[PDB]
Amino acid sequence: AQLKGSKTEENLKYAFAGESQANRRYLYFASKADVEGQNDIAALFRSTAEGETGHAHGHLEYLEAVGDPATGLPFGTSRQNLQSAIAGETHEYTDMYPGMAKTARDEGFEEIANWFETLAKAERSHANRYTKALDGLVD
Amino acid sequence: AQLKGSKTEENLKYAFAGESQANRRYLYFASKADVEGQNDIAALFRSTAEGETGHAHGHLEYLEAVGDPATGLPFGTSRQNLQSAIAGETHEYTDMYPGMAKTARDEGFEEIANWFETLAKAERSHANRYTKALDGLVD
Numbered sequence A, B: 001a002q003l004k005g006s007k008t009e010e011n012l013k014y015a016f017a018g019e020s021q022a023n024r025r026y027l028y029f030a031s032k033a034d035v036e037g038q039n040d041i042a043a044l045f046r047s048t049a050e051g052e053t054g055h056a057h058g059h060l061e062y063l064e065a066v067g068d069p070a071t072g073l074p075f076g077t078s079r080q081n082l083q084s085a086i087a088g089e090t091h092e093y094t095d096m097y098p099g100m101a102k103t104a105r106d107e108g109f110e111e112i113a114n115w116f117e118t119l120a121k122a123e124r125s126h127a128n129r130y131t132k133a134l135d136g137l138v139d
């Protein structure tokens, strides 16, 4: 059976997105529990988040057969991983975040539009720094 | 301007999913670099990943006004956060992972099917442990 083109490929991508968001959400919830003084709850959110890291990385390992879910490019070696990170980052800073900022401004959300513009600049920095590292890579 | 129902709400959800995945992907890439001996590259993936945590958590802060992107439910306090986590985990073990497992088996990916079944069981454990924590919450 060929994973490329299958429903199972799409399910792995969806589940990877879900596990990734679960870790982020659980760490955000841990920080809320921190401030409240709910240290036992915070520790449980953190421990569960480690589980979601293991799940997401297992999904990504299967996706090595088909490509990085963010870009379609192969991944595995540092050279490949940097090239994929660069392509994804370039999309975020040239297209995704500028477009989101425009939509937010048009809809009346000036603070959110400025946030998206801050993130476009931040992803441009990430893209350039990864490109510098790729040029310096000796493998 | 009301965030609920807007294109900006959908963009925050999409950007939250993207930043979450970027952190997970960059830490996976860092582990690849670790094994290769590319320690400077690994450190860069880790530092960039901290940036993506800050971005994702900023997106989530805006989404507090409309609901948890995984469940649609309120979030903020530990009680709310545990409630939303339990609902999401319950969806994962009663619906999402079992259905992904069946599709994998039907398509001939027996190992991936077994992986989805392991995760269904793990998410059920997560749900039940969060429920025990909510039962004990004093707030």
Ligand SMILES: [Mn+2]
Pocket: A019, A022, A051, A052, A055, A056, B119, B123
């Ligand atoms: Mn999980």
Ligand SMILES: [Mn+2]
Pocket: A089, A122, A123, A126, B022, B048, B051, B052
């Ligand atoms: Mn970035």
Ligand SMILES: [Mn+2]
Pocket: A119, A123, B019, B022, B051, B052, B055
């Ligand atoms: Mn980012």
Ligand SMILES: [Mn+2]
Pocket: A022, A048, A051, A052, B089, B122, B123, B126
């Ligand atoms: Mn879980």
